[PDB]
UniProtKB/Swiss-Prot annotation, chain A:
InterPro entries membership: ARM-like (IPR011989), ARM-type_fold (IPR016024), INTS4_8HBD (IPR056235)
Gene Ontology MF: a single term: protein-macromolecule adaptor activity
Designated name of the protein: Integrator complex subunit 4
Functional note: Component of the integrator complex, a multiprotein complex that terminates RNA polymerase II (Pol II) transcription in the promoter-proximal region of genes.
UniProtKB/Swiss-Prot annotation, chain B:
InterPro entries cross-referenced by the UniProt entry: Beta_Casp, Integrator_9su, IntS9-like_C, Metallo-B-lactamas, RibonucZ/Hydroxyglut_hydro
Annotated keywords: Cytoplasm, Isopeptide bond, Nucleus, Ubl conjugation
Species whose genome carries this gene: Homo sapiens
Coiled coil: none
Additional remark text: Although strongly related to RNA-specific endonuclease proteins, it lacks the HXHXDH motif that binds zinc and participates in the catalytic center. Its function as endonuclease is therefore unsure.
Superkingdom assignment: Eukaryota
Keyword Transmembrane helix set for record: no
One Pfam assignment: IntS9_C
Location relative to the cell: Nucleus; Cytoplasm
Name of the protein in its database record: Integrator complex subunit 9
Alphabetized Gene3D superfamilies for the sequence: 3.40.50.10890, Ribonuclease Z/Hydroxyacylglutathione hydrolase-like
Amino acid sequence: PSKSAALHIDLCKATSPADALQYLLQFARKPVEAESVEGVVRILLEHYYKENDPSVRLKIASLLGLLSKTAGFSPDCIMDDAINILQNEKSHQVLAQLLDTLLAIGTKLPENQAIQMRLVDVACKHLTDTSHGVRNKCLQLLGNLGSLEKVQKIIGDYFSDQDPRVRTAAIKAMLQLHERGLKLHQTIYNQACKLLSDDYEQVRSAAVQLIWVVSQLYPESIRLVDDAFGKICHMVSDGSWVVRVQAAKLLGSMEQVSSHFLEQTLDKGAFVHGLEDEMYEVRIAAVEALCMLAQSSPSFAEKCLDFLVDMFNDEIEEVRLQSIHTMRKISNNITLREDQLDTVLAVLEDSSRDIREALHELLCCTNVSTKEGIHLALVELLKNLTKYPTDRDSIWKCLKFLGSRHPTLVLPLVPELLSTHPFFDTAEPDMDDPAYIAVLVLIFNAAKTCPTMPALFSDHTFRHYAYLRDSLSHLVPALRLPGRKDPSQQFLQQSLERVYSLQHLDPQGAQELLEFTIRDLQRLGELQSELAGVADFSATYLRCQLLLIKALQEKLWNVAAPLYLKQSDLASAAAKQIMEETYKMEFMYSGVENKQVVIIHHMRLQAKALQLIVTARTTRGLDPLFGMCEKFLQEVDFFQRYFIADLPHLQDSFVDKLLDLMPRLMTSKPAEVVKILQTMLRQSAFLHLPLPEQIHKASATIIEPAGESDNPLRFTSGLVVALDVDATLEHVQDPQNTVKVQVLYPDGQAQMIHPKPADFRNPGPGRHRLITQVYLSHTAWTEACQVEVRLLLAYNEGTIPFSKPVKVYIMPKPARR
Amino acid sequence: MKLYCLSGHPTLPCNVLKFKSTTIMLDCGLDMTSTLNFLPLPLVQSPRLSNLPGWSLKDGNAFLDKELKECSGHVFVDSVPEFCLPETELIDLSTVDVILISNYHCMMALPYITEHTGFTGTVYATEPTVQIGRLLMEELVNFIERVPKAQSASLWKNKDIQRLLPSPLKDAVEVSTWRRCYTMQEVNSALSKIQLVGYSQKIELFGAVQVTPLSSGYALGSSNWIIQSHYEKVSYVSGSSLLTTHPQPMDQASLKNSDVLVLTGLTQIPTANPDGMVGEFCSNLALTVRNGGNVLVPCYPSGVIYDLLECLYQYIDSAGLSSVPLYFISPVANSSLEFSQIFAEWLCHNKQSKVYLPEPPFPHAELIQTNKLKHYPSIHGDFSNDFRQPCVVFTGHPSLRFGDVVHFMELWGKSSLNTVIFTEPDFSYLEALAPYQPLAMKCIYCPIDTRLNFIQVSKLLKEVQPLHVVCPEQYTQPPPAQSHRMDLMIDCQPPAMSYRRAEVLALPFKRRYEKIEIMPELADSLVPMEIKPGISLATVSAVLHTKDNKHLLQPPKPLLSGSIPVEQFVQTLEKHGFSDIKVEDTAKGHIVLLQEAETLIQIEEDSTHIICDNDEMLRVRLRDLVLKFLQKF
């Protein structure tokens, strides 16, 4: 159809460089065929194959390869491409088109034997061009077409051909052969070790990889991995930097080496030159290499220790961060005799927030064997506290782990660190000073094992231990001091069963039971935390049922339609609340499956029925009521279509016997339809909801700004201020496309700020950290007012709130002149 | 020898060249005029932009009410602004080997082609070009990033919708190939594969070809390239200013003795007068600050604004207007002024002689010790508590669709007391004001262009005359505005050539004379055998060592020419010992008979034919006798 029309238009136009190129470009850029008829269009591609102007033929066969990439065709396209290669071998452009089509066909889908990867490979090998016409690309053709698990000789004699580009493609073919296994041989080591001095770039950066792969294959040459690793270390000293990156990384792919030659790298020389040359690429590659070869080698590690302490002044935050990582990975049975001063003064920086938290992670996993090191580390970290009162929780964690790691070294510090004057009474220190708390949490984390430490405190120190144990139980551990020596699941099931069974009541009794169970479910959700989500889910469902029943018994359906009290209506808005609640079920709650989805979709259908009947009672225009009846019937059609299943499992519901009277609902006056919908909602049965096993409710806590700050944010009229928001998200699926921020100005106008996926963190499996900047501007105010900030959850066409409001003071001023 | 043309805009070009075996793709320009078709991106939402009437087609079938929205009789599509990339599907761009970069204005399309194709090659550019290109890339990605907008608009790209759209939205080429902006990772990766070349660095590629830059003078770091073998030279000029400017002046020496002089990157408006035009700049800026009120200048972080600052600094000393302050608002501002200060050896020769003395080359340093120029990273901070009405403000991207320029284009765009001063070409003046009309903001189209116009284009072509000329039709066809006049065109008298967007052109010169090198033993083992005066000859026989696309000759058939005289043949046979040899004549030849070895030889015009018996020593004797009475070829 469309392909035939395009072929007919191309044949009718038949312009050489004008119609063919533009038509092929339009065919590629417009859409994909996505059908088997594209293979028939390949026959159309065979129709224009016999033509001049080979650029058009190259574009056509490129389109043929693109069509083969859609897996529409199979062996017929392969046979046609083989015929075209064997017949239309005309210069480099058509060679490129044919080999690209062959490469696309070989990896299209099958990748199998029986003239699918063997005959094509034989045709590619038998058609080697005389100068660069197919050579590099037929080598990658014979790469991706493995013959059998036994053909390496043709690659082997092509290590010494003319073009360095063909050398690189032979290398990449050798790569893809190794990635399929194929049991590589030993002479590749010889052809590779003669391939280092190619006197040109872009081959050595992969020749080092070939040395690595044929070295870790098996170490048997005369000793094999030592000579190969020495060659790699020689390639570390190359002038070009890309080959240095490749050499350091591909020695970082190694895992076995002789020990003595590994200490030979630093004295008599690779790592003594492998660091201080280039940007973060070479340095990070080399230090990841020393990470792995300090992990593999239990020895040597003092040498990598003092080759990491020198490189603190590299003026790159990435180098600092990954350097903190590269010594926190190797911090096992390693002490710091003299190299601890620089690593504790490296914290001294203006903000360095990621660097600072990495340094606190380093300090809690390090090992040290001296006392004055503890003294200097403590005084420097207290100076950090007095300079940045921001990260007291992080330092409490690292001091806790520092005390837990080694308790013994800090025993003489306690007579010196705190006021323990022998005869003068020690005054009670400030409890709310959040710096004495850190040294206490050190002391009592180091007091768990050593017995000679309770005798060294004072009475106020035991009362401080009492309050720290009762307040921060996750910081100080329980000691042996003489001073300080499911029903919910069954209840939820019983309550849910009592709701489900007790449905044959007077509507007053049903309302009373529903209200009591709502209050019970909120109280249970507030008390519990493991079963809070399921309690809130059941509470939302029963709230929907409660509002539906309460709207069903209304005085609106006791008088006639003209005698309508507009203001006294209570059933009009109830449809909107239950609609918003159905949105709340299907987008707030994390772990849901198709049964919850079908039940809340059915509740949405009941909601739309309530909205339809109240609008039918309000208005008198025949065309709007007829139209809304038609939209409601097609919504019911959509519901039975998308949910064609699960009707046998859900019994005697509103929608089941709705579809029982479905053709009469097609042929009736809309007034008859709306009265039978009233009668339909009156004995519409209450469904049972099987609760999911694991459910969690999504919510947000905006941790900064807190909103209790009395100081205003002050700026100039018509200009913008950026306030940083940090909030914690828990149990939110796909925050990038869903979570947004909303700013309510005190004048009424709102702003819906979309966040960046980069600014979303993932601090674990279940909690996320949103850190963005909010942009505000107005036209001057007479006093600093309260701007509202709230996180919203969006869904597909709607937004519903899920975060606690926060408020900020804003002061826009005019210019001074 | 094929030129593949991938960019349709005249001064943001992309041209692949298949030379010997190389696939040198010259320049990667990202067409930003497509961004003019959208709504702007304000950092804080305005009631005006939020509340605009959505345009509806008369059919009403499509849901394009939420797609595109109209304003003052001009409709724009409401999503993130799209970018007009070249064809990445005309040829397989992984076969592109080396990308050459002329200037930072044609580098903005690099991340797309270098991380969405498979291009494993290298890109070469001068280090001022890569530094200002990095800063402009960060500028663009930051302004497109700040407030995110989702591409929710898709139905306006189908054929029948877009032909049923009104103007200017019909005037859009390949909207399906438009792609959203690029991210941090391919900024970092796109600037890793780049390499640093110098001005006319003799740099070889793959052992086959030679590329080299030249000084251009269009901007700080701009380069004009040459791709050449030893016997042919195709040069690519993209942007030049032989008018008096700040960077190193144009080179006219490596351009000559060439065959192709591709005229990419000429002036946007030929009808201009830059010295008087910046005089007009100073004039209306002075008038607006004299009435009392700020001026708004859309500007790139680099380039012509530097030149502007110089004269503007000088004009303060002529105007007595030191009270009004100067503001430069850009997220790359301090680094932009830094890189303006430091890249000084690439300036003029007398500017180099200014660098001889310990003084700053660019005079904005003198603007900052005089507390005149104040640079800020953003409005978010120090600009709030330092802003002074009236002012001169230099703002973000001149396309008037993203940056801080949209904020000052709002707010202040309410009174006729103020003005906005458009100074930068390749962005349409009336099209930039199109979302902002209706509007009372005073506007002066005062574009400053440094690129050479058609008169010096003619001077350049008659100076270093090529064998072929390649240019777009916008240089051949009269311009759409001043189509009534013939004078400001390309004026050459070979048949010039014309390429449209995505076209294949064969360059009509064929390689025929290539290059070979010989080791001296063969050179000494050759003898001259001069036969016809002035023209020597020599027999050569060797083997050819193949390595690194530079072929050699190493030691391990020449034929006969010249008719033999029969009389001298029989005379030297009689004097060599052979006897009783008898000669008879025919119509055109001679039959000569030797009774020894039973030999009969017939000689005709350009024909000899010996017939002998079973002999060896007399046979080879006759061979060396007859081959020494002629000349070997």
